[PDB]
């Protein structure tokens, strides 16, 4: 992504990484997961929490 | 389900409940042996619960029953979330009555602008957080092709249609997916995705259902 590399959940925005608020609407018992960044994976529930 | 109301005593009989533990996803009864739900619920482990209204209170009515083949569907992307359709079949046929029923297939698309009906047990709150112990209601017409991708650039596929609000207010959310999106006593959407829920300029969006009625006919004739 430009200058940069987006990594685990984000979203590559023309020449910066953001991530993304899309998410499926499941039911994560502890929430979605966070990624070395700390951005949330669109459809990836913490098995354990955060 | 933002922004919608509880749904009376026997209005939505094919709903069903799945759980691994704890509801997670919603579901479809089309036939004594089989649910439909969005693949993303995938779980090598599902008990289905029907006939369903309180899912705190045992009221008498429910079922439940154990998935026995959980077919996902052959081209489901996760990151795309395209194709995402789910059958299960129950390790036993559900007993029909009032309580449960089954929601029949869609017969053709449905059309922008059709009155439809979402229900389901997932977080009311577009912002907070609050899950209700009885299901959820809420009529939402179907939006045209264009305006759902004015909204999502690049994101909505030829197996995805916005229903909902563009103003926001009320929509599925986290909770709500694999539940029917019945328009016309037809299911014609399965909730699956969207930013966040309830924002405005951003409606839910579902799983196409019309697109995979020979996909789920043939699965079932084979299984
Ligand atoms: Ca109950």
């Given at each position: 992504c430009?200058?940069?590399?987006?990594?685990?959940?984000?979203?590559?925005?023309?020449?910066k990484?953001?991530?993304?608020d899309?998410?499926?609407?499941?039911?994560?018992?502890?929430?979605?997961?966070?990624?070395?960044?700390?951005?949330?994976?669109?459809?990836?529930?913490?098995?354990?929490?955060? | 389900?933002?922004?919608?109301?509880?749904?009376?005593?026997?209005?939505?009989?094919?709903?069903?409940?799945?759980?691994?533990?704890?509801?997670?996803?919603?579901?479809?009864?089309?036939?004594?042996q089989?649910?439909?739900?969005?693949?993303?619920?995938?779980?090598?482990?599902?008990?289905?619960?029907?006939?369903?209204?309180?899912?705190?209170?045992?009221?008498?009515?429910?079922?439940?029953?154990?998935?026995?083949?959980?077919?996902?569907?052959?081209?489901?992307?996760?990151?795309?979330?395209?194709?995402?359709?789910?059958?299960?079949?129950?390790?036993?046929?559900?007993?029909?009555?009032?309580?449960?029923?089954?929601?029949?297939?869609?017969?053709?698309?449905?059309?922008?602008?059709?009155?439809?009906?979402?229900?389901?047990?997932?977080?009311?709150?577009?912002?907070?957080?609050?899950?209700?112990?009885?299901?959820?209601?809420?009529?939402?017409?179907?939006?045209?092709d264009?305006?759902?991708?004015?909204?999502?650039?690049?994101?909505?596929?030829?197996?995805?249609?916005?229903?909902?609000?563009?103003?926001?207010?009320?929509?599925?959310?986290?909770?709500?997916?694999?539940?029917?999106?019945?328009?016309?006593?037809?299911?014609?959407?399965?909730?699956?995705?969207?930013?966040?829920?309830?924002?405005?300029?951003?409606?839910?969006?579902?799983?196409?259902?019309?697109?995979?009625?020979?996909?789920?006919?043939?699965?079932?004739?084979?299984?």
């Amino acid at each position: 992504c430009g200058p940069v590399t987006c990594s685990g959940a984000q979203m590559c925005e023309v020449d910066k990484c953001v991530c993304s608020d899309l998410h499926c609407k499941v039911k994560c018992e502890h929430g979605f997961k966070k990624d070395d960044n700390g951005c949330e994976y669109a459809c990836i529930c913490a098995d354990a929490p955060q | 389900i933002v922004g919608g109301y509880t749904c009376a005593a026997n209005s939505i009989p094919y709903q069903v409940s799945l759980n691994s533990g704890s509801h997670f996803c919603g579901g479809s009864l089309i036939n004594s042996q089989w649910v439909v739900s969005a693949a993303h619920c995938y779980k090598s482990r599902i008990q289905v619960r029907l006939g369903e209204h309180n899912i705190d209170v045992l009221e008498g009515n429910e079922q439940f029953i154990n998935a026995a083949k959980i077919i996902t569907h052959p081209n489901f992307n996760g990151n795309t979330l395209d194709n995402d359709i789910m059958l299960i079949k129950l390790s036993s046929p559900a007993t029909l009555x009032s309580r449960v029923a089954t929601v029949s297939l869609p017969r053709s698309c449905a059309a922008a602008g059709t009155e439809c009906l979402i229900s389901g047990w997932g977080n009311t709150k577009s912002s907070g957080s609050s899950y209700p112990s009885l299901l959820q209601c809420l009529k939402a017409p179907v939006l045209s092709d264009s305006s759902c991708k004015s909204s999502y650039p690049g994101q909505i596929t030829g197996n995805m249609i916005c229903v909902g609000f563009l103003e926001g207010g009320k929509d599925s959310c986290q909770g709500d997916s694999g539940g029917p999106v019945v328009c016309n006593g037809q299911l014609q959407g399965i909730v699956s995705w969207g930013y966040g829920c309830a924002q405005k300029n951003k409606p839910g969006v579902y799983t196409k259902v019309c697109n995979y009625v020979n996909w789920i006919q043939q699965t079932i004739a084979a299984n």
